[PDB]
Amino acid sequence: GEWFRDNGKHALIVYDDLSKQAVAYRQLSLLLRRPPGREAYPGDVFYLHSRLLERAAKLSEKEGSGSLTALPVIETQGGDVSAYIPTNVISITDGQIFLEAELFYKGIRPAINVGLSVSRVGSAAQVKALKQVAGSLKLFLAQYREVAAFAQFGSDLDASTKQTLVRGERLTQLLKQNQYSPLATEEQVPLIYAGVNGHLDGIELSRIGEFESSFLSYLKSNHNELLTEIREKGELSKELLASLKSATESFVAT
């Protein structure tokens, strides 16, 4: 991948997965009778994964503007992030996408735990239009994760608290996605816009999957220029926001 990086091209390298590499290096180190460390891993496994991962970089315009992006995979045993290798890799990396089985079996697939998942580069890496519309999404999901736990306790609640459930459940439902079916940001922006601004509050929670299926087909067929602008420019002007709101309310009328 560093050839692409160093020749001004862009590369994405996935390691699937670094835990098995650490196991292999532990085998080598112990058969060489080097001193064991924690969990019988040798002393320099952190040096290993660090000198592996630090090779991901974005080079300056003088150096050719090339870049290499790393997505190391790590398999935790029973969610124990306190283990040696998970700790080392979590320390080294610039962020994490955290996958949980309880979410998977609740039907939330691709099962990303939005609470634990953190990107340390943050919004600087995000496309401008999705940065705009998705501003409040993190706040609403953060509120939902608490208020849902409160609600399952069986306590009655005020309408202001109930609204947090109303939008949180439908946003959690909205982020579901089928395997091998990635969405263009052109297509993602309208969905997040509709979900965040409360347009979905009138939809039965179980039918949200239909909306996300049909709404885009509407936009592609009746508002194609809006999608074309969102794709080409990558940012939402006031006029594009107004048009997107108009189309969203026109469709939601059903």
Binding site: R33, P35, P36, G37, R38, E39, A40, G78, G79, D80, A149, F150, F153, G154, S155, D156
Partner: protein, 256 residues
Amino acid sequence: ATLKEVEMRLKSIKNIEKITKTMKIVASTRLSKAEKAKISAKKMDEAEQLFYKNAEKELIVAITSDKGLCGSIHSQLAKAVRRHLNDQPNADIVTIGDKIKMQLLRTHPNNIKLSINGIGKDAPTFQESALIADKLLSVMKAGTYPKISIFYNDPVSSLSFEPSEKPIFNAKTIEQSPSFGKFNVPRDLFEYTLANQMLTAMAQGYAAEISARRNAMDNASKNAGDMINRYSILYNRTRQAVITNELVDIITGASS
């Protein structure tokens, strides 16, 4: 279970215990006013009793709590009242409180003909009760009913309650009784004493609801403790096991 999952469930149980403690505190706060109101309404019923004792189709009235977490008393009493009234299961039912509406399913659930809401948001009082009862009289002709059954929880104990029900009846129930010689006055009675009995049942139900909640939420908080204890025992046993394995690891590290 794995240590991580044990920690997750233990935290969930502890949070539930905290929430139930807060609701217990709220119930204990309401308890004094609830009991005083119930006693006051029971005493105040004597004015109508002084005449009703001497004078001596179907309908359904339900007066229960507006929300759950009232122990089993609130819903179970209304369910038992519906089961007992199932001698005329098709009676038109006027329902107050979500728990009473659910317990109405013990009789025919389709008998509903009137509804009320918001009972649990404030202490029992005649101020809105009178307007609600006037709307009920307009919509259901309650003033001429031969027997309309209104059921409410009886706070028989400091922390216990039992189901109770009473029949509201038309003016003819008093005007036609042969004992009336001991005394439309009868219709004025069928309005005023009807409302008074409704208020007394409402106050008794509120007192029973608050006492049952104060008892049952504390029982829930106490029950949380046993499972928390046993899970803590399991958690510490797992900690011992992992500590033993760590010791084994460092011993094998030192020996070679």
